[PDB]
Design a protein around this ligand. Structure first.
Ligand SMILES: *C(=O)c1cccc2c1CCN2
Ligand SMILES: *C(=O)c1cccc2c1CCN2
Lengths: 305, 305
């Protein structure tokens, strides 16, 4: 029993983190096979923050301008290329610690582990969700650019996020590992801001199922609701609409607890309308939305890697 | 910016996790140099749960009764010994992945990362505190015995917890790596229960400093308090007493924010007496006590390993 914000073990990703330096700028890179992936912002200088043309900046660089360090071992760059907002540095050494991996672009509402790094050295690991507004609520200081987010499936690392920047509200924006930003953000200094966010309804429902699995039942009631009636209330409280696909995805948890999905929706409706009146759920006085249905199953049933 | 419940990168510990089987019981072990450490409960059977004499149980075993698996590689046990509630299996192979490490017995209020494992395979990582009542609020399923807790300092892993059992309230009890339980618990089936717990005051104060560092200031006020006056209020709300040692430990955060420790104590007093009136701090509607002063500094200043 118990329920924690649980990250994936980070070792397979630790072995891939490197430092990349170009000029005065140093940040983190991801070394997989003989390629290092990092934010293209590394080639920027202090005469460029305002709309730089990265194709011009890159044409003016040569391989010897890139310093890549894996631990105390310098790696020789033998080729360089740009893909969207990521740089690909070909190096002369294949990472012997390369895990089985793939690159995936995730949907809003999905969760992943972040390995926060500084100067190529991992510092900590934590769980994030991709918010509906395509930001993440991370924990990143200066030097964290190029830190990555990932899930692990069996023995395979699915990389889904590379960190680029902090927006004015303190939340974070970045790219998939092919260099495409999540959301409308761009890697240049402009007035961009996070859009209004919404709560991830299917995740709140999953977490209520987690609570039942762990013996928290005070919020249950005898009522049911219709999808349409529930979504009318969701919209009022700035919750994402709940689809039939979400209902089907919650099927396993509904079957394990014997609580129909639309019955749990009526409990959530009551929680939204009345609050918790001083009670907690799984140690939280707020409704938690950064656990997916799969996260609950994995932690309330114990799968490993 | 941002503030997350952040674990240490787990890779150095992943490389030490093994499976140990004796008879019908399988759990996790920790392989360091040529020794595997695991809960002595592994030698128990279904004719023993009620006060077993472990010295008798152990004298009746031989090395070939212990099956140790590291991945798909069986390790040959060449010696076995008991130390308090842990078994030490000498194996014929030194773990080539042994990190720099030490064993430490932590005080209540200190935090650590847990690498939850099943059958020798890591499944997830999360941050725990040792509660004042010497339980932890973990997340563990059947098969998690022998999972370990740890901190990392520079390149050194300080192992501080090995998981043994779940108590009736769903919280968790275990030992240091020398096999001594935290708290009054014993590894046998009896009516033992968690004692009444208390909130870790110095950690709440650290977290309020984290919030200020991150721009949450609504809970501040112009008042100060005396240590004695503050502790009178703490006791009322079942908070641990705050000592001068705690005040000195908060010195760095007090200096970075320019908020005297006893000034923050008066803010906490007001929060205890009046609640949050619908506001949040660092995304929480409760006062968080599982971040130490050192945890705040490391995450709000970015040290790595
Ligand atoms: C880090 O990679 C990065 C990417 C894009 C824009 C910025 C940064 C750091 C500062 N601004
Ligand atoms: C696991 O190691 C362990 C230790 C002590 C007591 C028990 C267990 C699991 C079940 N009871």
């Amino acid at each position: 029993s118990g329920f924690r914000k649980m990250a994936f073990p980070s070792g397979k990703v630790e072995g891939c983190m490197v430092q990349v330096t170009c000029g005065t700028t140093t940040l983190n890179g991801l070394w997989l096979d003989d390629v290092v992936y990092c934010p293209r912002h590394v080639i920027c200088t202090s005469e460029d923050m305002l709309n730089p043309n990265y194709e011009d900046l890159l044409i003016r660089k040569s391989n010897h301008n890139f310093l890549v360090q894996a631990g105390n071992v310098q790696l020789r760059v033998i080729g360089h290329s740009m893909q969207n907002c990521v740089l690909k540095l070909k190096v002369d050494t294949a990472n012997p610690k390369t895990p089985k991996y793939k690159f995936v672009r995730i949907q809003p509402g999905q969760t992943f582990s972040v390995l926060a790094c500084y100067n190529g050295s991992p510092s900590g690991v934590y769980q994030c969700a991709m918010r509906p507004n395509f930001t993440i609520k991370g924990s990143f200081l200066n030097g964290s650019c190029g830190s990555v987010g990932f899930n692990i499936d069996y023995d395979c690392v699915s990389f889904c996020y590379m960190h680029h920047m902090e927006l004015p509200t303190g939340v974070h924006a970045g790219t998939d590992l092919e260099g495409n930003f999540y959301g409308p953000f761009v890697d240049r200094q402009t007035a961009q801001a996070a859009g209004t966010d919404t709560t991830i309804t299917v995740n709140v429902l999953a977490w209520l199922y987690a609570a039942v699995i762990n013996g928290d039942r005070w919020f249950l009631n005898r009522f049911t609701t219709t999808l349409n009636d529930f979504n009318l209330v969701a919209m009022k409280y700035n919750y994402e609409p709940l689809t039939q696909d979400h209902v089907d995805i919650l099927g396993p948890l509904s079957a394990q607890t014997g609580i129909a999905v639309l019955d749990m929706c009526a409990s959530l409706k009551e929680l939204l309308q009345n609050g918790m009146n001083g009670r907690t759920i799984l140690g939280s006085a707020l409704l938690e939305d950064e656990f997916t249905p799969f996260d609950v199953v994995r932690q309330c049933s114990g799968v490993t890697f």
